[PDB]
Design a binder for this molecule. Sequence first.
Ligand SMILES: Nc1ccc(Nc2nc(Nc3cc(C4CC4)[nH]n3)c3ccccc3n2)cc1
Length: 273
Amino acid sequence: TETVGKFEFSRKDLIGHGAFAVVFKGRHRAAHDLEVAVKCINKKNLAKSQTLLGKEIKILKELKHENIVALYDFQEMANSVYLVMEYCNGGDLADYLHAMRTLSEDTIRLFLQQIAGAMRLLHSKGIIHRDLKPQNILLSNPAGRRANPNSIRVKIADFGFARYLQSNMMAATLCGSPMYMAPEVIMSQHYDGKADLWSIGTIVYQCLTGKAPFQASSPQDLRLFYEKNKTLVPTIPRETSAPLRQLLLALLQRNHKDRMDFDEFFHHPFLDA
Ligand SMILES: Nc1ccc(Nc2nc(Nc3cc(C4CC4)[nH]n3)c3ccccc3n2)cc1
């Protein structure tokens, strides 16, 4: 049994194993019914794991929001780093959208309204996430067993690649997940917060179809694909409502100049609200 502050955990219940973090379920030492997820270093990738978990602490200690997985406490030392996080009891969006055989437009609206709320906070704080994908959107239902799925709340996780970006500057670090990366990122160009909006477009597209909007055999294929094709148009099911289709096309603009910006996203009628 390992302890971090007022919390405890063990390697008994593995929530997830990643290259740069291992996550175990734990609990409050006094209030046992308070569940937590504890992120720990992956010692097989010690340096990078330590770096990413440290970065995540720096960003999350500044981000309190329902739709961002909460950081309850943390413990950073020279040779170990732990994050004690809110436990999300619904698994991830990658699994859910697949189990449901894609999601209804009403459910997509419900989830996207929540993601938009979290993104409003990120944008106001000058923070870009850079690894948005359905695997990093977690579900949690505050109600009891067998509760209505309309009560599902979604929360953005895994801020290890996040950074502050000053509003007159651009970022250029290649990071993220290739299938969800904006074209300008995977082409090693400069980018800003609109890269996250592309990623959000890909999340919405996957919720609708089950698949990524642009299929290439590989990341190099995907990159060559963006380089060779100046106008990208994703295959969207014909029965999709016109406003959801328009939102998707606006977010999935190849050229970031033409891509939907934050104000346009926040106030898009599909999200009304
Ligand atoms: N870094 C990381 C992110 C997501 C996962 N996957 C995950 N995560 C679950 N809950 C989490 C996780 C967290 C903090 C975010 C790590 N809080 N709550 C979960 C709950 C029920 C069933 C499957 C689940 N799968 C693993 C590691």
